[PDB]
Write a protein that holds these residues in place. Structure first.
Motif, PDB file in Angstrom:
ATOM      1  N   UNK B 447       0.838  -1.194   0.000  1.00  0.00           N
ATOM      2  CA  UNK B 447       0.000   0.000   0.000  1.00  0.00           C
ATOM      3  C   UNK B 447       0.873   1.243   0.000  1.00  0.00           C
ATOM      4  N   UNK B 448       0.832   1.986  -1.099  1.00  0.00           N
ATOM      5  CA  UNK B 448       1.824   3.024  -1.335  1.00  0.00           C
ATOM      6  C   UNK B 448       1.250   4.419  -1.588  1.00  0.00           C
ATOM      7  N   UNK B 449       1.874   5.417  -0.975  1.00  0.00           N
ATOM      8  CA  UNK B 449       1.555   6.809  -1.252  1.00  0.00           C
ATOM      9  C   UNK B 449       2.812   7.553  -1.674  1.00  0.00           C
ATOM     10  N   UNK B 450       2.747   8.240  -2.810  1.00  0.00           N
ATOM     11  CA  UNK B 450       3.862   9.045  -3.261  1.00  0.00           C
ATOM     12  C   UNK B 450       3.433  10.499  -3.344  1.00  0.00           C
ATOM     13  N   UNK B 451       4.320  11.400  -2.952  1.00  0.00           N
ATOM     14  CA  UNK B 451       4.087  12.815  -3.184  1.00  0.00           C
ATOM     15  C   UNK B 451       4.965  13.181  -4.363  1.00  0.00           C
ATOM     16  N   UNK B 452       4.341  13.641  -5.440  1.00  0.00           N
ATOM     17  CA  UNK B 452       4.994  13.676  -6.746  1.00  0.00           C
ATOM     18  C   UNK B 452       4.786  15.005  -7.466  1.00  0.00           C
ATOM     19  N   UNK B 453       5.857  15.549  -8.062  1.00  0.00           N
ATOM     20  CA  UNK B 453       5.727  16.757  -8.883  1.00  0.00           C
ATOM     21  C   UNK B 453       5.050  16.427 -10.204  1.00  0.00           C
ATOM     22  N   UNK B 454       4.174  17.303 -10.683  1.00  0.00           N
ATOM     23  CA  UNK B 454       3.591  17.129 -12.005  1.00  0.00           C
ATOM     24  C   UNK B 454       4.673  17.355 -13.058  1.00  0.00           C
ATOM     25  N   UNK B 455       4.953  16.328 -13.873  1.00  0.00           N
ATOM     26  CA  UNK B 455       5.993  16.442 -14.902  1.00  0.00           C
ATOM     27  C   UNK B 455       5.518  17.401 -15.976  1.00  0.00           C
TER      28      UNK B 455
END
Lengths: 504, 455, 510, 507
Positions: B447-455
């Motif tokens: 179960x994974x959560x990533x905080x990610x920049x919009x490419x």
């Protein structure tokens, strides 16, 4: 089991909502003042008596139409109907009179109706020759200065914002527009110019005479149209002058500038009307609820009356029952915190004015029980300035006590109404029976949530304690008569002194 | 100075109100699903495309009228309009189909009437006592209500059974079941849908007093609820309706189940291109109450201004969504809450309030995972990336879920397939104006959560 | 029924109080760092090893006393003791070394020439203070030498002067150029080399003296993890310490000690410039009225929590345990209340430096901190921390707060965090989870400094870096799982949260 | 600026902490009652007078020691000291007398002998060794100590500093130290079968009634029935004497709710409690008990070792300063001194320090949340007097009044006001000397004893007492002319409660 007391006990708002119970009956008392616009359908003495019985607290006269003579007659009929109950002071209900100004309105000329079609061209002229020759080609209107304040690309609304035009060209003495939203166009319809700074006077020569007439007629309050700023309020105040110094000025917020400059307007005013009709044309309709909740919150915060107005039960102009959106609107205005709610065409000219008034009374009473007082009072406490004023301490003390002993009423003896206003601002569940010998105080008290004004007609007794006792006993007789409470219940009495008293 | 973020930071609800700002523009995303009843005004393929472009998410079919062949045709037209946008998966918007049953109606036809008998006809506008007390123009086969009278019609009649069957045949996404009075009514409908329709969402319609009183058991049995205010407001005093509405929305929010506010929300827009101030307020307050979806009936079915009605609900919902007091709502949901997937969803929602993300992207097959996030009511839109077409359509029932249908082949390496689907979401969001390069979004991969920049 | 979870569910603080349960046992993990001052009682490798086992996380060197040679030997022993456990990486506990500066102290001379000697001062008697170095080591009943040459220009007749933790009180009755004639207001025993306070006076000594500069450079040479800077009055004091540590000591944590009124007044700028704060109650409760110290303490802890910077509560926490095997009730209360306040660390001074019961004192801090940590009202604390937190574009902050929120939802046995500098784990700690934060690092200094922050349990990975990233991550995570199981923080099947450096994973213990 | 008013306004507890200001001075009034144990150091009339001036509100006599003859003299001296101020009724401060029972104690015989870590010891019940205790043989007065003991059981002596491991008992010193005569002995985890009220306790309690004491602190209360036994001895003659239950063992904590119900109040007796249960758990019991007493509206006392080091030093340790402040912050109605005043070298300093710390701490309370919670957790009723009391407290917050003046006969009305924990001092005017003394058990109640005779004209009588209160407040710097105070008139003879609250300017 009654008055949504189970929901009242919830520890969260969410749980409060979950506990709202259609089977839990409200108390008899209805705290939210009801304001009714008077016109053809409700102007007769006989109809007026029924509107008082149905729940009307304030009669609103719309000075956008009618002569002084026509309004003087309305006012005369209101008072006749009102005083027909004066023989029993225990059951007599004060009724206020409100004068709603024309203010800086813009109106079209005389057409007969013409169909304006999307995409078509329409010229706006100021040439008085077309003043009564309005058609689908040329439309005259009475704002002579219109060309100096509107730009190319800006929109013009006509008839409650139902017809819309876009300004395409600015002629020497005219505007060329294109119809966007079409519809049938009648005569002397209201015009709005969103985005424009209209430079008509806040108080016109006509407004001045109407205000003076209000003073002469001893009206209780003025609803001042299109208030944009504190200086607008001051002019109204100056016109009412020394003779009308006790007349309450309610500023109508109906354009973007009024919203933007709301804080200074509120400080200068005795109260506010959320005038959703014009407001929802001047700004996008989808944003009106934001302005309404903002203004109600800020009025609640300041302890000044706020009125929610316009189209609350609109379909009832033609039908005996409201729509579900309308039922929701009235309830939510009350939940928001509105001191009063209003009816316009629903009572002025509709086919079911009595049903409209009764439906507002019914919804308000249900909604008042559904308020989450636990949170509201906590927050009003916190946001209230800690000051030295002893009457202010007594007022909150009485409201706190009223929640504790779940009292049937807070009885307040008041000359100017202020003492009672101070209690109302803390928003008790219990009705506030304001006993006064001042007839104007009694009428104006309707502006405040929870205040049930009663007019004491007994002479002032020589002994102070006897005079107090007389008035409190009066209030008790009213409460018993109206079914607010009964022998053996417990009520709070404010005379600076607070007493907790068993009803005889 | 956008999204009512100043009001969002208020310490009290009163100060929250005080700070609501007509000059604070909302975000582009609109979280509340719009359900439109289809009819003569909106049946054509051409108009349906406009309604999709205008904001329609669910097509409601009222089986109180019309034949199977009629409804089949409407269903056909909905799917043609919908698929007309399929060429660009980034721009395709799923559209769900809802079948609304006739149920135990009474039309000007009730057998044991005289054995249970105030009588109302036509939206309770015309009133009758066993003399015409109210009245006006009476019409054909109008609807009748007998408040207080125990009408003993069947919860699921023969017509209903055949209609539900037809629902299964037609691959509809959900059923709105009328006049549900108790848990056993719900179980009958569920049985009819049977094993073939086990995936079809059942929404119970509460339109009478018994439905309210027995609300809890009905909710436990159902997949969601509709506050059916039309009939409800004839069956009980009109002035009590808002109490029922707020109770049901409250309890649905508490349960994590979809709730629809329905009926007369923009009624005047049937004949006029603009709504009344009461209607503006009703839509806004329904969203503030916590409604997952709002509905249009006559306004889109038969009125002169179908598209305007849809656009107005869209505009109002969006404004109201920003005016929600999330600080209090989120805290109360957390406290009132009774599984790692649940911990991950609440964590994503918390993160999204913290960094004010442009979105929470959730990869989901059944939709459950995205549902779990929606139940904590984030401000940020929930872009639900699924390969399952039915999941994509049914997801509209939940506030905040913007479903997107991935049509890329399944990559062999798991991490690559996740990344492909996430970038699909990024592309959708950029295209719709939800966020832009450099922005930050939260990603739940399943179960994974990533905080990610919009490419 | 464990970890005060019934109390944790209460809807109000009042009800939270009413539910606190002496029969609800805490978890094994203890989150609050324990700092122990080293001295004669605790300088041997044997004792140091036992102190570590009892729960010491940080060894404090008090540079108010002792030569550089003395402190080097202390540090040497600490590391010998610490490394004696290194052979099993799973059970190794990093131990930090803190240099506590002398700073602008005033000290008396030698009583009868002995470090250990005493004399009695009788109330009402007279006592002459001299600066004449002839009496440096000839202090007694009638003549008391101190080392603050300019004392006569800062004090006056009527001025009060305190000696030895403010226990001896003197009032100036007469001045001189070389002396002061005082009246003993409160007598007692007067030892050697005791600290002097002039609470009314404006002491002119520099924050960082030339001796302090030498000591700081020595700290850098000795590779200490942190500095506790005495009598910090303003941001510029902090900057001077920072500058002296220089490039080579740039990673050394500076903790400002707040021990005077000015340090309290200018607290905000001090905190901004510092890596953290010590509530130095000893001097502080002499410099300001003793009855106000709890205010300064709670204000500083609150503002440190708000800023996300470690704060240490120090001094006299278990004072009676210098002579007795069990603490007083006030002392049990004090430790518990420091942890409830929000203190990242607690400290022992005389209790471990010279007392007869150093292991019992460390054990008692451990026991109390653990009970109190469960007694925290996390429901309100987390809600307030959040509400008071800036919305920011920082993705690591979003990840940290999401991890903490989740850890409450699933009541996890831990939040595992892979961190190089420690910052990532610090960001989690600032949201005050109930679950312990296991910070896996390859950086030994990071592992030691991590003890400054509440709830961080640092573990030092000794494994070589793996070429494959996912394999290196898996290695460090499995290291954490192994430590957790061995320490009894959790077991196979429990759900834990993993931050990898930004990803959050919710996995079961293998 | 003053009384932590800035912190008072904070919207969160955390921000409330952040705003606490060492430069914001408190008001003059100190709301928390100070209980002082009287002994050799504090027993003389001269010293007692200073004790009163320093802040003493209650004199506690520990009947674990001393003869009736000794205690009668102490009581006489307290009263001489206290009445020495009675000439000026405006400045007279009532002082209560509390009798603290011996109860089911276990003690050792007579002998000091240093005990060694790792050594055998003979626990004997053989009364021959009663006055011959030593390094090898140790006699104790608990004759049935064998039915309750077991192998491996632990035993503590002298505030639990000496520990031992198990018709006689052979033991090992698990923890050594010097041993004196007649030290307290605890048996944690053992069920001690001693009477809640022994023959001696009974005579002590009767003597207490005869001596007209204001309250009893009943030692080692385990259950509701213990409380009833105490109430029974006090009987009809002692029916108005308050019973404070001392919670000193695990059973008392366990059965706390039923004890609290049966009692007039509670003492958190941390000395014994911290020996009976692990010391690190005591703060849990303390906060639990203080919280539950605040919830029940009954007085709670925090006791023991609060300023312990001041037995020998003129200034407290930092942990002691903290302990006092936190007890007040917790919500304790009263705080207590034992050895610090009974035998220490600095009794007056110890009293003064409790006074200074309590006042600073009272200002630092987060009233905003506390009042909100007390209300929300308070059963609504029809009780008019309840409504008037809460109304007065709310009003007092709104207008930051200088005081709430309450007229009361038995004190009950004033207690009702105090349960809502106003910031403002509650000046309780009474004509009943006992009510004036017992009122000290309640946070914020400042009792004044009206000596005037009852007027015939009630309005004249009310004005008289109220003006008395105005004069007290002014003389003690609580407020000044032109300030605003709340007045509750209370009971009117022959009519009943007035149920009246007035908001009044100070004359």
């Amino acid at each position: 089991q009654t008055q949504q007391l189970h929901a009242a006990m919830a520890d969260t708002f969410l749980e409060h909502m979950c506990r709202l119970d259609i089977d839990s009956p409200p108390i008899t008392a209805r705290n939210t003042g009801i304001i009714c616009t008077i016109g053809p359908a409700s102007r007769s003495v006989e109809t007026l008596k029924e509107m008082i019985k149905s729940g009307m607290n304030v009669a609103r006269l719309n000075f956008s139409h009618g002569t002084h003579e026509y309004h003087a007659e309305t006012i005369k009929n209101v008072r006749t109907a009102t005083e027909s109950f004066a023989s029993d002071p225990i059951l007599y209900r004060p009724v206020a009179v409100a004068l709603d100004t024309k203010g800086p309105e813009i109106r079209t000329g005389l057409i007969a109706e013409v169909e304006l079609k999307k995409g078509a061209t329409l010229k706006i002229t100021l040439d008085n020759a077309y003043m009564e020759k309005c058609d689908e080609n040329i439309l005259w209107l009475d704002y002579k200065n219109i060309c100096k304040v509107v730009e190319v690309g800006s929109k013009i609304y006509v008839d409650d914002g139902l017809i819309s035009l876009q300004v395409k060209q600015k002629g020497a003495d005219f505007l060329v527009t294109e119809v966007e939203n079409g519809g049938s166009l009648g005569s002397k319809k209201g015009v709005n110019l969103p985005g424009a700074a209209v430079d008509l006077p806040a108080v016109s020569e006509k407004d001045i005479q109407d205000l003076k007439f209000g003073v002469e007629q001893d009206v209780d309050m003025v609803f001042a149209s299109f208030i944009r700023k504190a200086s607008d309020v001051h002019e109204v105040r100056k016109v009412l002058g020394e003779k009308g110094k006790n007349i309450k000025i309610i500023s109508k917020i109906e354009n973007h500038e009024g919203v933007r400059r709301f804080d200074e307007i509120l400080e200068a005013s005795d109260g506010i009307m959320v005038a959703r009709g014009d407001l929802g044309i001047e700004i996008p309709a989808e944003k009106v609820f934001l302005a309404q909740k903002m203004m109600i919150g800020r009025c609640n915060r300041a302890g000044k009356p706020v009125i929610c107005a316009t189209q609350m039960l609109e379909s009832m102009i033609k039908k005996p029952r409201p729509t579900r959106a309308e039922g929701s609107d009235v309830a939510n205005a009350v939940l928001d915190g509105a001191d009063c709610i209003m009816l316009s065409g629903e009572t002025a000219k509709g086919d079911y004015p009595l049903e409209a008034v009764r439906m507002q009374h019914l919804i308000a009473r249900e909604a008042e029980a559904a308020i989450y007082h636990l949170q509201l009072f906590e927050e009003l406490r916190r946001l209230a300035p800690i000051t030295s004023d002893p009457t202010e301490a007594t007022a909150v003390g009485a409201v706190e006590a009223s929640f504790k002993c779940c009292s049937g009423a807070i009885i307040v003896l008041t000359k100017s109404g202020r003492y009672a206003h101070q209690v109302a601002r803390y928003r008790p569940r219990a009705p506030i029976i304001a006993v006064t010998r001042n007839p104007q105080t009694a009428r104006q008290a309707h502006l405040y949530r929870g205040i049930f004004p009663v007019l004491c007609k007994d002479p002032v007794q020589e002994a102070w304690a006897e005079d107090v006792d007389l008035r409190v006993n009066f209030a008790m007789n009213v409460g018993k008569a109206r079914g607010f409470f009964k022998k053996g219940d417990v009520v709070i009495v404010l005379t600076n002194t607070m007493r907790v008293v068993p009803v005889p």
